[PDB]
Design an enzyme around this catalytic site. Structure first.
Site, PDB file in Angstrom:
ATOM      1  N   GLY A 203      26.560 -36.531  -3.384  1.00 28.52           N
ATOM      2  CA  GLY A 203      26.359 -35.099  -3.463  1.00 28.52           C
ATOM      3  C   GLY A 203      26.667 -34.571  -4.848  1.00 28.52           C
ATOM      4  O   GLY A 203      27.436 -35.186  -5.592  1.00 28.52           O
TER       5      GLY A 203
ATOM      6  N   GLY B 299      27.271 -38.799  -0.861  1.00 28.13           N
ATOM      7  CA  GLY B 299      26.233 -38.178  -0.056  1.00 28.13           C
ATOM      8  C   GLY B 299      25.187 -39.172   0.403  1.00 28.13           C
ATOM      9  O   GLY B 299      24.643 -39.055   1.504  1.00 28.13           O
TER      10      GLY B 299
ATOM     11  N   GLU C 225      35.541 -41.068  -3.689  1.00 26.10           N
ATOM     12  CA  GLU C 225      36.038 -39.698  -3.638  1.00 26.10           C
ATOM     13  C   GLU C 225      37.507 -39.587  -4.015  1.00 26.10           C
ATOM     14  O   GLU C 225      37.925 -38.546  -4.532  1.00 26.10           O
ATOM     15  CB  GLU C 225      35.837 -39.103  -2.241  1.00 26.10           C
TER      16      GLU C 225
ATOM     17  N   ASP D 252      33.844 -37.472   3.012  1.00 19.24           N
ATOM     18  CA  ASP D 252      33.042 -36.437   3.639  1.00 19.24           C
ATOM     19  C   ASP D 252      31.806 -37.056   4.296  1.00 19.24           C
ATOM     20  O   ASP D 252      31.751 -38.269   4.525  1.00 19.24           O
ATOM     21  CB  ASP D 252      32.683 -35.384   2.587  1.00 19.24           C
TER      22      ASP D 252
END
Ligand SMILES: [K+]
Ligand SMILES: [K+]
Ligand SMILES: [K+]
Ligand SMILES: [K+]
Ligand SMILES: [K+]
Ligand SMILES: [K+]
Ligand SMILES: [Mg+2]
Ligand SMILES: [Mg+2]
Ligand SMILES: [Mg+2]
Ligand SMILES: [Mg+2]
Ligand SMILES: [Mg+2]
Ligand SMILES: [Mg+2]
Ligand SMILES: [Mg+2]
Ligand SMILES: [Mg+2]
Ligand SMILES: [Mg+2]
Ligand SMILES: [Mg+2]
Ligand SMILES: [Mg+2]
Ligand SMILES: [Mg+2]
Ligand SMILES: [Mg+2]
Ligand SMILES: [Mg+2]
Ligand SMILES: [Mg+2]
Ligand SMILES: [Mg+2]
Ligand SMILES: [Mg+2]
Ligand SMILES: [Mg+2]
Ligand SMILES: [Mg+2]
Ligand SMILES: [Mg+2]
Ligand SMILES: [Mg+2]
Ligand SMILES: [Mg+2]
Ligand SMILES: [Mg+2]
Ligand SMILES: [Mg+2]
Ligand SMILES: [Mg+2]
Ligand SMILES: [Mg+2]
Lengths: 102, 237, 49, 66, 154, 467, 64, 123, 53
Positions: free
Chosen positions: F67, F116, F139, F147
């Site tokens: 992302g 993502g 992350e 996520d």
RNA sequence: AAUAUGAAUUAAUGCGAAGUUGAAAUACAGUUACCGUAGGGGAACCUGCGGUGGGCUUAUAAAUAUCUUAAAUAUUCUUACA
RNA sequence: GGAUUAAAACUAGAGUAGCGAAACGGAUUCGAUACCCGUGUAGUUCUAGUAGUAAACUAUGAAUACAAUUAUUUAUAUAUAUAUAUAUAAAUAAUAAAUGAAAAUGAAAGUAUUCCACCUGAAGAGUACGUUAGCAAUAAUGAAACUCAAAACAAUAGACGG
RNA sequence: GAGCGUUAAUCAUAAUGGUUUAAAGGAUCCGUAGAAUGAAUUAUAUAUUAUAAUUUAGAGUUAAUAAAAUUAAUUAAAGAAUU
């Protein structure tokens, strides 16, 4: 053989098919129109379950070749709405059928 | 021949028999074919690269990409006739596979004609098992032959030890001569050493040839005599 | 389009007719004792006796 | 041989080499796996599988396969 | 040019019969609009600008220097052992051009033979040209436009 | 005029979605997510689309590098918190739509699939990997959390050393990159297909259609998709050796085995007090080094989510990620460093790790607040055409390599059968390779079964016992 | 002859399709050399073992 | 033919029956006077003595008319009415005389199809 | 679709194009002229063997 | 001068039945037929000159062939060996 | 509209070996105004003209765009480890598809587009009449009446063949 | 059916045609009219057309380089044989 039928009464659209010397022009018809076609085609439609159909035969009107030409046309010259939709990735709607739907 | 329709649609024609009731019982293949659809496109497919040499197929060099003069000293300012012909056919024609090693292979056997006389087995064992380190010419599993030289030459040019293909090829050739000389001596000496310890051999290669030539020369003697007697009678006429 | 909704009202516009439900409703207000029965838009013609 | 090419097989060809067409084994493997699954399905369903081959030498393979 | 359009219509029919996946057509505004309509209607898998030798992978600006070598490359679709684009014929011909008002276009889409043009069939695409723009007949009727009936694709 | 960020195309009855941001490695912004989310709802209503194919136009360079969080960092620095919450509502809503999508989705993970990108594939039962696949969840180095529902997927799909989410915690907390065949063997990828074969596979996917009167949403069609992909799978490279050895798998299974109220310190204790082989001991030190270069707050939040989204339903796990992401961009209690760390690494190129300041041990209440919805900020996931929730993926198990818990179940069942027979390793291999219809001939299935029996089973006489 | 009879009889067919052979005449073509006994016996063996596994799985489900 | 050739006259020939009684001048029947009664031989493969008559119509055209029925009383100078219709086996006889009109009486003792032979209904 | 079908040559591009095209025509004329002089030189070398008196 | 009518007078052709004189065409039709043109003759036809195939593509051999471990080894082999 | 246009023919002036309508003879034959043989005139040749006709045929008008293969030549170009190899066109042969009544066509007799010529049952008739052109033979243009339910093509199986 | 038949007429009943071999490609080419047909881009207009500008893919011009020695007309020669 199985032949596609639109609403189990007629053909999908119009057909202009050439079988040897026989030129077959078949047009789909409205419900209750009846069979208005060459007598040879009439008998085939009766057995096949076609109720509404119009059409004309040009050039050669040999009965044997009309019967074979008609059978060939009903299979090789028709495309169902479902087959057209899937090939083109589009939705095909029968306006007359939707008009009377809930 | 026309693209057939009835071989790939057996499932759909069968389904009409079952739905109508003409066929009472579903065939055993029916479920298997339904879950594994046949491929029914039968189309010609374009190709944009030669897998052997990576040459790009279907690329046109525009005049903007040729700003400098040519070998004749003239600039290119307009497309030529070849550039204006559609080249769709090249997209569909099976590419001709080419290899640099093919050129060296022809050279090696032109320089060493008698290497052809060493029988080669074309039957493969298992291509996937070949674990070869071409830092050296000899390899466990394969014979020493012209291919050993070619693969060694490619390794040299691949490792950039040599720049010119000719120099790498010459280097490999000498390694090949050394291995060929050590084997010619091992065989001569082995025969000599065996005879010195009482080894006996029925027929030598030279003897084998003499016997075969005798068999042929015996039939030839008969025919010559027969045909030198029919001539005498026929000529007497 | 494959995901375009097309319904009875859209079909009616294509065929340039009132929706079929409207036709049914207008046919139920025809009875002399039925609701909706109305006839006055024609009382606009000058007559002399 | 490229001289005997039936152009309807064009999509299966990997290239031409030494006067013959090279079949693309990447496609052969995918087709082979698909064909194999069909044989397995029919066998597991109890169907009759007939192996037809009439070239010299094929009998041994054909008999063992059956 | 209607002649060029006739050539393209015949070319696509020929390519379908042999079942080639990719073919090229002349690079012109009319051809591009014609091809784009077929692409949006699901008759063509792909539409790429390119040259005589093949579709361009990266954008190549078209100029007078290379205009003569430009081509449009279209991908044909085949499903269930049948071509998606089976027939492609002109309605308005070079030697007999047909201009219809929006009222007559509505009759053509309703089953009425207008000026010998057979009516629109189920699953068929009829294209109309109005002010040098090509659109589906149903779209021309929505915009109240009068135009030349160019061709019918099935 | 500009090239659209995501390109949509038709492939017979298959609809191909292609990520088209090559310069950004196909990073996912709000625009891309919104476009894909809207177009997928339309395809769900359509009766001419049988399956969808999510790929990239940059392969083999990358499928999705993650992302677009660098842009979210600038928003935080500019207090554009509404923009940031829009980026996560779109992305997380798209990940929820893919997870609950009723038609087969086939993701081609041909390249870097990190962040993502993992959300685009982890939620699909058909996630195909290639030699160029590079799966990672980096992350912890940026100050964010795992996520895109990775805390609900990884604890449920990993195959080895994942009985108590030990391997799931290892990948999420260390950010280790898994490559190609290793991703397939761990369960990150359902299938392993050579990149060269992707073109052919795509064409076959467009040509297959549900038979007779079966819709594309039926289980029957899902089996057909699985079989089609299998025809293009090829045997693994001869030299290939699994990345993690049994000894390395024993360190993860023990050092990352926490309780329902575990803490990152407990993992640090195990990695610092581990005993065993020299390789295992050295391996535990390597993990300890890595885990000490991460964000002290991110590691605790990640552990919290893994221990919370490993027993909850999909909708509550994805919703809890939206709350956490919003509660991190808006750092009300100055407990995280997501924004500052993101600028240190992405907005500004700095190889060195960001010097961390929030090095405390957040309490259970502090973690609860960071992972619970604030009554002042109302955020909800966009509605999809399925609107369904469930605690177990409906298809992931059938079409991936079996997990260590499924092999154990068959050994226990077989060992407790009235037959009174002995469970043998050979019988286990046969039962998983030549019995289950959906797993018949599955690549690298016998190798995985032998890794499990050699490390989890005890061979006594001609039988096997589940140590 | 056999291929046309199978079509007429709606019998699915598998065949090795060489470069000079018509693919559309069979339901499931296998592109490959049909002239070498090694190539043919290699492909036939794979299909035969696939059938064997199906047969063994049917006999196994009957036992249990 | 090309579109311009059709514009210049090219087209399908028209199908319309042609007159087979040109001497009547588009009249249902014309009066005439018998010039000479004759007996003619059918063309093969027919054999008979077909009674015909040469007649001069009131418009000056001279025609050959077949006398239908069994037995006739037609002579020279007899007033007859001639209608269209050829005698197939007699070439050149393209007309029929009407029985029961003028001086030609109806067929004697005709029972069936009397209207075609000028026979009145028996009481 | 939004891309223009053709971009006209800029005035500068037309100038460089004319320079190259003029050069091409001039070079060919020069090369043919020099070839003719080289043949006239090789004919002078042999004109001592030709008879005019 | 035109139109119409009759007209001495005169030309061409159709059909109808069988006969007479030959046997021109269809097979290599017993001289290959036919096309253009010219001359000749009871009649078909005959002859000259060029052209055409709607006639000969109907087309079908001066023959000659070779050496490596014949087996304690290949030939057997049933998911085994590796 | 114009130009060119085989053979025969015609108008003048030359030429005339061989061939050869006709004619006159010899044979053959029941007869032989023929086939075969002889003598052999026009013609066949050249120069200058007239005429514009042929199974003047590929019995297939011209142009453009396009579609699956092989073989064999030819041309141009490219390369080299120099004589082949690789390319792109043309021609021809055999074909796929397509087309067709079929025989077959095959880059058209396929898929399309543009223009021109031409046809509308047989026979009567390419005749009659008129007109135009020509030294002439003739060439072009070109009907109707009467009569008939025929007439024609491809292919099939036979029968027959000096 | 108080009409029926018959004769005389009209409309309909296949060009959603053909021309190697069945009716039908002109001996051939050149070229005038054509109220026949015919490239590309852009901008206007009153719009499948007009106009303007621009472009080179059809069609041409001139060179350069290589190749070929045919087809017309005319003039000058040769050859075997025949009488
Ligand atoms: K004769
Ligand atoms: K003649
Ligand atoms: K003659
Ligand atoms: K003479
Ligand atoms: K013409
Ligand atoms: K024809
Ligand atoms: Mg073969
Ligand atoms: Mg005779
Ligand atoms: Mg005769
Ligand atoms: Mg004769
Ligand atoms: Mg004579
Ligand atoms: Mg002659
Ligand atoms: Mg004959
Ligand atoms: Mg013949
Ligand atoms: Mg001549
Ligand atoms: Mg004279
Ligand atoms: Mg005489
Ligand atoms: Mg005599
Ligand atoms: Mg004589
Ligand atoms: Mg003249
Ligand atoms: Mg004449
Ligand atoms: Mg003529
Ligand atoms: Mg000629
Ligand atoms: Mg020309
Ligand atoms: Mg005349
Ligand atoms: Mg015939
Ligand atoms: Mg009445
Ligand atoms: Mg009509
Ligand atoms: Mg024609
Ligand atoms: Mg001609
Ligand atoms: Mg003619
Ligand atoms: Mg040019």
């Amino acid at each position: 053989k199985e032949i596609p039928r639109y609403e189990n009464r007629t053909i999908y659209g119009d057909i202009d098919f050439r079988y040897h010397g026989v030129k077959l022009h078949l047009r789909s018809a409205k419900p209750g129109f009846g069979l208005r076609v060459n007598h040879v085609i009439f008998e085939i439609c009766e057995c096949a379950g076609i109720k509404d159909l119009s059409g004309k035969v040009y050039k050669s009107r040999n009965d044997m070749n009309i019967a074979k030409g008609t059978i060939e046309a009903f299979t090789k010259a028709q495309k169902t709405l479902d087959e057209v939709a899937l090939g083109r990735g589009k939705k095909l709607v029968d306006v007359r059928k939707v008009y009377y739907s809930s | 021949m026309k693209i057939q329709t009835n071989a790939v649609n057996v499932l759909q024609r069968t389904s009409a028999y079952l739905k109508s009731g003409l066929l009472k019982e579903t065939p055993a293949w029916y479920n298997v074919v339904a879950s594994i659809p046949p491929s029914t496109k039968f189309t010609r497919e374009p190709r944009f690269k030669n897998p052997s040499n990576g040459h790009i197929i279907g690329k046109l060099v525009d005049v903007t990409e040729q700003p400098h003069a040519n070998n004749k000293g003239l600039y290119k300012t307009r497309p030529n006739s070849s550039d204006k012909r559609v080249g769709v056919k090249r997209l569909y024609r099976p590419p001709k596979l080419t290899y640099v090693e093919d050129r060296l292979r022809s050279l090696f056997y032109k320089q060493h004609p008698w290497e052809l006389s060493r029988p080669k087995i074309l039957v493969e064992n298992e291509i996937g098992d070949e674990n070869y380190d071409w830092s050296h010419m000899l390899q466990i599993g394969r014979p020493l032959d012209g291919e050993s030289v070619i693969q060694r030459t490619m390794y040299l040019i691949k490792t950039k030890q040599y720049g010119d293909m000719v120099e790498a090829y010459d280097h490999a050739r000498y390694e090949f001569y050394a291995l060929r000389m050590q084997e010619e001596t091992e065989q001569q000496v082995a025969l000599e050493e065996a005879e010195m310890f009482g080894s006996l051999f029925g027929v030598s290669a030279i003897e084998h040839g003499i016997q075969k030539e005798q068999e042929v020369l015996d039939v030839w003697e008969k025919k010559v005599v027969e045909e030198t007697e029919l001539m005498a009678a026929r000529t007497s006429n | 389009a494959e995901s375009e909704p097309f319904g009875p009202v859209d079909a009616a516009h294509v065929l340039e007719l009132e929706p079929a439900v409207e036709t049914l409703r207008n046919l139920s207000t025809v009875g002399e004792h039925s609701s909706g029965h109305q006839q006055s838009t024609n009382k606009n013609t000058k007559v002399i006796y | 041989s490229t001289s005997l090419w039936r152009s309807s097989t064009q999509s299966y060809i990997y290239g031409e080499y030494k006067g013959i067409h090279i079949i693309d084994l990447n496609q052969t493997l995918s087709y082979l796996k698909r064909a194999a699954k069909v044989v397995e399905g029919v066998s597991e369903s109890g169907g009759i599988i007939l192996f037809l081959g009439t070239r010299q030498g094929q009998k041994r393979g054909l008999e063992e396969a059956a | 040019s209607l002649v060029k359009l006739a050539n393209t219509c015949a070319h696509l029919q020929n390519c379908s019969k042999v079942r080639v996946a990719l073919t090229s057509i002349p690079y012109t505004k009319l051809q591009l609009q014609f091809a784009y309509n077929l692409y949006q209607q699901g008759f063509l898998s792909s539409l790429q600008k390119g040259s005589t030798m093949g579709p361009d992978k990266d954008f190549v600006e078209v100029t007078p220097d290379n205009i003569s070598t430009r081509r449009l490359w279209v991908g044909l679709k085949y499903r269930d052992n049948k071509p998606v684009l089976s027939s492609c014929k002109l309605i308005s011909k070079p030697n007999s051009r047909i201009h219809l008002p929006m009222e007559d276009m509505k009759k053509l889409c309703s089953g009425v033979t207008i000026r010998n043009i057979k009516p629109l069939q189920p699953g068929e695409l009829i294209l109309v040209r109005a002010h040098n723009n090509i659109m589906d007949i149903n779209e021309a009727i929505s915009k109240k436009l009068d135009g030349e009936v160019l061709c019918r694709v099935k | 005029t500009d090239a659209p960020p995501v390109l949509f195309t038709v492939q017979d009855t298959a609809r191909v979605i292609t990520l088209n941001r090559p310069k950004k490695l196909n990073a996912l912004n709000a625009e891309m997510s919104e476009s894909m989310f809207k177009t997928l709802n339309e395809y769900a209503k359509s009766d001419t689309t049988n399956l969808v194919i999510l790929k990239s136009s940059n392969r083999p360079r990358s499928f999705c590098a993650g992302g677009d969080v660098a842009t979210v960092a600038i928003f935080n620095f500019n207090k554009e918190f509404a923009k940031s919450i829009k980026f996560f509502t779109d992305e997380y809503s798209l990940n929820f739509q893919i997870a609950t999508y009723l038609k087969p989705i086939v993701t081609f993970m041909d390249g870097i699939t990190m962040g993502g990108g993992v959300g685009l594939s982890i939620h699909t039962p058909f996630r195909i990997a290639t030699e160029n696949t590079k799966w990672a969840m980096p992350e912890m180095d940026i100050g964010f959390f795992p996520d895109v529902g990775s805390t609900f997927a990884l604890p449920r799909i990993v195959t080895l050393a994942n009985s108590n989410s030990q391997m799931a915690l290892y990948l999420c907390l260390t950010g280790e990159v898994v490559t190609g065949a290793d991703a397939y063997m761990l369960g990150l990828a359902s299938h392993y297909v050579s990149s060269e074969n992707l073109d052919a596979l795509q064409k076959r996917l467009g040509e297959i259609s549900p038979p007779f009167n079966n819709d594309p949403q039926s289980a029957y069609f899902f089996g057909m998709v699985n079989e089609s992909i299998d025809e293009f799978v090829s045997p693994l490279p001869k030299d290939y050796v699994f990345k993690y050895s049994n000894e390395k798998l024993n360190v993860i299974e023990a050092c990352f085995n926490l309780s329902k109220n575990g803490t990152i310190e407990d993992i640090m204790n195990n990695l610092r007090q581990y005993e065993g082989s020299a390789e295992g001991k050295a391996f535990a030190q390597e993990i300890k080094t890595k885990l000490l270069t991460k964000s002290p707050s991110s590691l605790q939040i990640a552990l919290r989510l893994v221990q919370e989204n490993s027993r909850d339903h999909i909708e509550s796990a994805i919703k809890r990620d939206l709350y956490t992401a919003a509660n991190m961009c808006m750092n009300q209690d100055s407990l995280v460093e997501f924004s500052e760390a993101t600028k240190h690494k992405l907005i500004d190129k700095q190889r060195v790790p960001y010097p961390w300041t929030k090095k405390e041990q957040l309490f259970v209440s502090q973690l609860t607040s960071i992972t619970s919805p604030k009554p002042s900020l109302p955020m909800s996931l966009l509605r999809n055409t399925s609107n369904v929730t469930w605690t177990q993926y409906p298809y992931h198990s059938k079409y991936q390599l079996p997990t260590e818990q499924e092999i154990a179940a068959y050994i226990e069942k077989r060992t407790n059968d009235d037959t009174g027979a002995k469970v043998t390793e050979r019988e286990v291999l046969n039962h998983f390779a030549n019995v289950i219809p959906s797993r018949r001939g599955k690549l690298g299935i016998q190798s995985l079964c032998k890794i499990v029996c050699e490390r989890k089973c005890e061979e006594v006489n001609d039988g096997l016992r589940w140590k | 002859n056999a291929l046309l009879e199978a079509i007429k009889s709606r019998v699915p067919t598998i065949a090795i399709i060489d470069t000079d052979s018509e693919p559309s005449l069979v339901t499931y073509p296998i592109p490959g050399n049909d002239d070498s006994l090694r190539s043919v016996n290699f492909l036939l063996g794979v299909l035969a073992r696939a059938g064997q596994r199906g047969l063994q799985n049917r006999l196994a489900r009957n036992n249990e | 033919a090309t579109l311009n050739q059709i514009k210049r006259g090219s087209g399908p020939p028209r199908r319309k029956k042609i007159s087979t009684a040109p001497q009547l001048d588009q009249c249902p029947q014309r009066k005439g006077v018998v010039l000479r009664v004759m007996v003619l031989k059918p063309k093969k493969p027919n054999s008979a003595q077909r009674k015909a008559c040469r007649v001069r119509l009131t418009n000056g055209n001279v025609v050959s008319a077949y006398i239908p029925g069994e037995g006739h009383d037609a002579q020279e100078h007899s007033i007859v009415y001639v209608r269209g219709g050829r005698c197939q086996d007699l070439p050149g006889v393209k007309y029929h005389v009407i029985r029961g009109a003028g001086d030609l009486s109806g067929v004697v003792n005709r029972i069936s199809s009397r209207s075609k032979y000028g026979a009145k209904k028996p009481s | 679709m939004s891309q223009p079908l053709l971009r006209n040559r800029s005035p500068e591009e037309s100038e460089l194009l004319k320079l190259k095209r003029n050069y091409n025509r001039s070079l060919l004329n020069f090369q043919a002229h020099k070839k003719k002089l080289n043949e006239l030189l090789n004919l002078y070398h042999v004109a001592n063997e030709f008879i005019v008196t």
